[PDB]
Amino acid sequence: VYLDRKLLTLEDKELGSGNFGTVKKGYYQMKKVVKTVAVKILKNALKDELLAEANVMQQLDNPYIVRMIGICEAESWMLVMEMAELGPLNKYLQQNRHVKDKNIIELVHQVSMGMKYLEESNFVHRDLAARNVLLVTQHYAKISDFGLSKALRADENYYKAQWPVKWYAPECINYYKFSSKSDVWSFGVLMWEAFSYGQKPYRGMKGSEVTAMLEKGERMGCPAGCPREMYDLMNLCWTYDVENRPGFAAVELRLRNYYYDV
């Protein structure tokens, strides 16, 4: 799992940045070829968090999730991942309002397949949103950003926290309980974002105003040009009572069926 720093070449430019530090593009020397990578570099609390993130990614193996190549302990701690060249889905759609409905359905279906896998594997993502889906190509999405993610214990169906409120289900806010069904709620917000071309959800509202709106049974409206069936699926993801909300098996099947007849 530990990579050799001498086999990594970084670019100077940064792709992004935050309290942890920076994300830069680089190249990792393999047997013959070089592999383009995205490298999360700590400008260092922070250590354990990066190590926990890599620990999650190390356990996942699925085409619609960002793969970890390894960790590099060098001038800084570095989490080396396969590169998603086109970057975050929200930003991509904000810059490319031409993308067709059918292409959006294809991408959100790919996210649902990743998430179905994540749910089967008993991990909760806890930060599922359009900014955390990355594009390989205009037709290939991957789930990223496993910093808040939790491996559920073998005999528990949720994680009790001890916040991206606009993406959180009522049971997360009210009871601090995070399940695969909480991620389904998030997935519905992600779908709304995708069909809105990377607009922000609940525009202009405080977290507490969002919670009140939801408790009145109010939900965001159908984005322009979003198909009825896809809005109906969003509303099903925003099922208030977690017990009655679909899991990702049911969500992925709905998307699959709709895509393969649209």
Ligand SMILES: COc1cc(Nc2nccc(-c3cc(C(=O)N[C@@H](C)CN4CCC4)n(C)n3)n2)cc(OC)c1
């Ligand atoms: C071409 O432009 C871009 C390409 C890429 N590609 C690409 N590929 C594979 C992996 C990753 C990647 C980025 C991050 C990350 O930590 N992002 C920070 C800024 C925000 N997170 C929210 C909590 C931390 N992680 C965990 N994985 N990124 C990314 C671009 O981020 C803005 C931009």
